[PDB]
Amino acid sequence: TQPQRTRYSIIQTKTEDEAKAVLDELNKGGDFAALAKEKSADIISARNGGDMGWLEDATIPDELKNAGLKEKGQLSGVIKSSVGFLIVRLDDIQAAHHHHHH
Secondary structure, eight states, rough: OOEEEEEEEEEEEESHHHHHHHHHHHHSSSSSHHHHTTTTHHHHHHHHTEEEEEEETTOOOHHHHTOOOSSSEEEEEEEETTTTEEEEEEEEEEOOOOTOOO
């Protein structure tokens, strides 16, 4: 009995306009990573292709709890914040064991 892990990619946009520009491109579904590096103020982490890294389930901050991204491949999650708009993408889903042996 251990926590499953989720790989989220997230990028911060200046306005909803920026978010729409980002989600419009990823709506075609070609590259999210590209969108991440160019406009996002996330780029401290976005330079990794928008990948924030593998987080463990139930260690997730409430911000991404509202992202609703449990199904792998689902992108264009726009999180409305006062600080700006966050774009969340699902890179992968692992039920803990999924790698070699957990």
